[PDB]
From TrEMBL, chain C:
Disulfide bonds: 101-164, 203-259
Protein name: MHC class I antigen
Purpose of the protein: Involved in the presentation of foreign antigens to the immune system.
Membrane topology listed for this record: Single-pass type I membrane protein
Originating gene: SLA-2
Organism: Sus scrofa
GO terms for biological process, alphabetical: antigen processing and presentation of peptide antigen via MHC class I; immune response
Similarity comment text for this entry: Belongs to the MHC class I family.
Domain Ig-like: 185-271
Annotated Gene Ontology cellular component terms: lumenal side of endoplasmic reticulum membrane; MHC class I protein complex; phagocytic vesicle membrane
Location(s), subcellular: Membrane
Keywords: Glycoprotein, Immunity, Membrane, MHC I, Signal, Transmembrane, Transmembrane helix
Length: 98, 9, 275
C-alpha cells in the first residue's frame, strides 16, 4: 500500500509585502512515512523546520514544513517534495491567492 | 501520560 | 464535542541499517503536546505545547522511559509481523497504533479505543467493550490469541477507565486558555478575474480552533455546493487552522453570492460578501 502526498502551499497570515510571515508546505495523505521536503526561494533550498510526523484515521501521514519569511513583489517561493511514490520530485509554487 | 504495556505481537 | 487524549505510535523497520525507528505524538483533541523520536540525539519525550512545559522531570523521565521500552518492543514486533506474512527481509515496513480516551460529562470514560495497522492496512482493534479484540486477518489472529492468553485488554481497560481520563482532565486544566476556549476564524472574501465570462470568489477563514468548521456559498438563498471548490482544512502552524471556499460567478453578480461560516468560536453564524 502506497499513497502519494497531497501538497498545499500557503502563508500563515495573508501575504502582505514587507511584513514578515510564515511559509507553509503542508504535506498529507501519504504512505510510507519516508519523505523529503524542501522550501525554495527563486529556486534554492533554505533552512526550514517541521512539525512531528502524525497520521490520520485512514493511516496516511501528514506534517507541516515551514519557515519564517518576508513577502514582497519580487521573490518567488515554492515547495519541493519527493516520495517513493513520485517519478520525479513534485514542485508546487506558492500562490498568495490560491 | 503514556500507557505502560510491553506487549509482543 | 467531548475531549480526548490520544497517542499515535509509528514503527518503521530499516533492515538495511539493521535498526528501526519509533515515533510517538500525543494529542489532546486537535492539539499536539508531546513527541518522541528514537532517531533523535539522546531521544526523549519532549513538550510541544506551551502548557505541558510546567511538568517536572519526574513526568519527563517516566514518559521517556516508557517510550524507549515501547520502541524496543516494536523493533521485534516489526520482525514478528514480517514472519506472520512470510515477507522478505529486504524492504522497510511499518506498524501504526492509535489509542485514546474520550472524557464523559461525569468525569469518567465516555469511550476508549485502540487500533493497530500494518503497512497502512488495518491489523487489529480493541472492541468497544474493552474486553475483546477484532482481528482483520490470519496474522492478526495469532496476535489476538496471544493478547487473550495474557489478558492484554484488562491492562488497556484499566488505563482507559483510570489513568487516561485523569491525565486528560489535568491537561484540560493546564492548557485551558487554548484547549477549552473556542477560537473563531478571521474571515474575508477575495475576488480573482479570469476570462470574460468568469470571476472567482474566494471565502477565507483563518486561525480557527477547533478544526471543525462550515464554509458554504449561497446564491440568493440557494446552495452552490455543486460548483464550489473547497480546500482541505490546513494548520496555520501555531495550533490553529485555515480553510477556504471558492466558486466562479459572472463578472457582475458578485453581490448575488454569499459565503456562510459556522464555527463554535462565533457567537452567531456569519454571512460575508465582497466589497
Amino acid at each position: 500500500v502506497a499513497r502519494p502526498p497531497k501538497v498545499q502551499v500557503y502563508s500563515r497570515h495573508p501575504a502582505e509585502n514587507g511584513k514578515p510571515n510564515y511559509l507553509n508546505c503542508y504535506v498529507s495523505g501519504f504512505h510510507p512515512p519516508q519523505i523529503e521536503i524542501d522550501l525554495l526561494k527563486n529556486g534554492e533550498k533554505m533552512n526550514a523546520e517541521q512539525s512531528d510526523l502524525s497520521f490520520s484515521k485512514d493511516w496516511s501521514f501528514y506534517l507541516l514544513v515551514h519557515t519564517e519569511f518576508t513577502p514582497n513583489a519580487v521573490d518567488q517561493y515554492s515547495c519541493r517534495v519527493k516520495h517513493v511514490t513520485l517519478d520525479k520530485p513534485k514542485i508546487v509554487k506558492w500562490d498568495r491567492d490560491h | 501520560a503514556l500507557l505502560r504495556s510491553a506487549t509482543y505481537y | 464535542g467531548p475531549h480526548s487524549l490520544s497517542y499515535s505510535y509509528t514503527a518503521v523497520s530499516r533492515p538495511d541499517r539493521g535498526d528501526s525507528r519509533f515515533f510517538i505524538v500525543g494529542y489532546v483533541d486537535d492539539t499536539q503536546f508531546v513527541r518522541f523520536d528514537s532517531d533523535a540525539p539522546n531521544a526523549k519525550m519532549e513538550p510541544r505545547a506551551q502548557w505541558i512545559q510546567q511538568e517536572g522531570q519526574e513526568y519527563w523521565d517516566r514518559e521517556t522511559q516508557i517510550s524507549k521500552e515501547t520502541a524496543q518492543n516494536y523493533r521485534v514486533d516489526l520482525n514478528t509481523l514480517r514472519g506472520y506474512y512470510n515477507q522478505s527481509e529486504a524492504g522497510s515496513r511499518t506498524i501504526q497504533r492509535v489509542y485514546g480516551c474520550y472524557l464523559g460529562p461525569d468525569g469518567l470514560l465516555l469511550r476508549g479505543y485502540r487500533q493497530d495497522a500494518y503497512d497502512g492496512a488495518d491489523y487489529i482493534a480493541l472492541n468497544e467493550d474493552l474486553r475483546s479484540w477484532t482481528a482483520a486477518d490470519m496474522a492478526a489472529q495469532i496476535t489476538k490469541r496471544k493478547w487473550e492468553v495474557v489478558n492484554e485488554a484488562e491492562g488497556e481497560r484499566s488505563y482507559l477507565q483510570g489513568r487516561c481520563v485523569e491525565w486528560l482532565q489535568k491537561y484540560l486544566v493546564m492548557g485551558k486558555d487554548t484547549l477549552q476556549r473556542a477560537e473563531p476564524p478571521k474571515t474575508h472574501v477575495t475576488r480573482h478575474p479570469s476570462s470574460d465570462l468568469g470571476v472567482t470568489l474566494r471565502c477565507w477563514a483563518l486561525g480557527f480552533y477547533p478544526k471543525e468548521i462550515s464554509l458554504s456559498w449561497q446564491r440568493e438563498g440557494q446552495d452552490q455546493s455543486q460548483d464550489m471548490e473547497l480546500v482541505e482544512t490546513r494548520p496555520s502552524g501555531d495550533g490553529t487552522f485555515q480553510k477556504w471556499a471558492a466558486l466562479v460567478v459572472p463578472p457582475g453578480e458578485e453581490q448575488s453570492y454569499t459565503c456562510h461560516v459556522q464555527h463554535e468560536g462565533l457567537q452567531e453564524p456569519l454571512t460575508l460578501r465582497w466589497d
